Amino acid sequence: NPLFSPYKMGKFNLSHRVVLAPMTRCRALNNIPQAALGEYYEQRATAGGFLITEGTMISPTSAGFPHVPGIFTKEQVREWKKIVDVVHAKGAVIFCQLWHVGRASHEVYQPAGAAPISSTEKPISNRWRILMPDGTHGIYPKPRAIGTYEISQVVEDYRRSALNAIEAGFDGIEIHGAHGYLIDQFLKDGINDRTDEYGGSLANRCKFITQVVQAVVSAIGADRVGVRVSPAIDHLDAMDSNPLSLGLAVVERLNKIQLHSGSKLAYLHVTQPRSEEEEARLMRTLRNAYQGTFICSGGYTRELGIEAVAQGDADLVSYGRLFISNPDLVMRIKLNAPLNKYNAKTFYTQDPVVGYTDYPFLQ
Ligand SMILES: Cc1cc2nc3c(=O)[nH]c(=O)nc-3n(C[C@H](O)[C@H](O)[C@H](O)COP(=O)(O)O)c2cc1C
């Protein structure tokens, strides 16, 4: 089984290729990591396995979901350290995903009820609705388009959060540059309508992600930095007129950052939509273009994960929903044991146990 051949992720010796995909679960009450998160990640951790946390806020303005953890306060760092410790006690490697939602927020999530920030002043359309703290769905508001000073300060928030992640003991961080959130609002020409140096050309649209990656690379080293993008996913009105060219432009800049810094990133992580042959060809095109480790994600199964590694399409495969309902997903994939179904109703609830840590292990 190629998913259980060892893999050298730069500094990190992995024993298998089954990765926990980053997943917002909303149990980090008041943006503070809680004991429940420790139980949840420990349940899923394996010796030599790689885990990526839920998206974690880099600043007071970066959230668009209830009760997501941050890593911008000293209190959050102290609580994260307890979770990293129980994961390292199992011999796993764990990265913290740094997440800014940009315009995908609401006054209820913003300090002083201020408008969310973005590349643009245009709202997400009412084709999409935001999960509210009371479990209803609300309307995305008009964001505020930020200037280049403010852009530089958001980059500094990524830099400081990366340093905080290292202080909590994380092995590294992942830049969330996917799914129509802040970075993707700069990348995608369906969102970025700017006429300054961060808008227009493909090069201009890639400037923000380039500066974010350069900042965290300079702070903690490239081998502790992963980057996640989704050029072909149109979530929250995040379409681009040429997804493959956009993805190749990002990949070229990642390659150049590595050559200039003299070190490889931990990995590039791409999520695909689930045309099937065309989507697979676009993922392989990005993989072939990138000088380093490639993590594929989106709709993978045991069979599709085995094929991806066996055919050279990816080095690692991340699993989201199947890891929600199978704490021992790695062992089940190893044994080809039947997998248990997941319950979407408890993906984003606040209960520390129900639908979070009470999915059973194999008997
Ligand atoms: C409930 C839930 C929360 C998620 N939260 C995040 C997140 O915070 N950051 C992120 O990059 N992806 C997030 N994702 C996307 C997953 O990382 C992953 O790409 C997707 O679930 C993989 O597809 P799969 O579920 O079929 O394995 C989330 C997915 C789900 C279902």
Contact 30, 67 (CB under 8 A): yes
Let me know: does 179 contact 236? Beta carbons within 8 Å: yes
Q: List binding-site positions for substrate.
A: 176-179, 274
> Hunting for tokens 């830099």 — which residue is that?
159
> Do the strands 172-177 and 225-229 form a parallel or antiparallel pair, or are they unpaired?
parallel
Q: Are 62 and 31 in contact (CB under 8 A)?
A: no
Residues 2-346: name the CATH superfamily: Aldolase class I (3.20.20.70)
Query: Among 3, 20, 24, which residue has the most ligand 1 atoms within 8 Å of its CB, making it the best to mutate?
Result: 24
- Residues 40 and 34: their CA atoms lie apart, in Å, by 10
Q: What amino acid is encoded at 71 in this protein?
A: I
Q: What separation in Å is there between the alpha carbon of 313 and the centre of ligand 1?
A: 20
SS (H, E, C) 63-109: CCCCCCCECCCHHHHHHHHHHHHHHHCCCCEEEEEEECCCCCCCHHH
In contact, 239 and 190? CB cutoff 8 Å:
yes
Q: Is the CB of 128 under 6 A from ligand 1?
A: no
Angstrom distance (rounded) from CA 289 to CA 163:
29
Catalytic residues, which ones? 181
Binding-site positions read 22-24, 55, 97, 176-179, 228, 274, 299, 320-321
Experimental method: X-ray
321 lines ligand 1 (CB under 6 A): yes
Number of Cβ within 10 Å of residue 130's Cβ equals: 20
Residue located nearest, by CA, to atom 4 of ligand 1: 23
Who's near 326: CB < 8 A, 6+ residues apart? Answer: 332, 339, 340, 359
Please tell me if the CB atom of residue 68 comes closer than 6 angstroms to any atom of ligand 1. Answer: no
Q: What is the whole-number distance in angstroms between the Cα of residue 216 and the centre of ligand 1? A: 23
How do the domains of the chain map onto residue ranges?
Answer: 2-346
281 to each of 18, 65, 219, 269, 313, how far by Cα in Å? 22, 33, 35, 16, 9
Q: How far is CA 85 from CA 37, 76, 205, in A?
A: 12, 14, 38
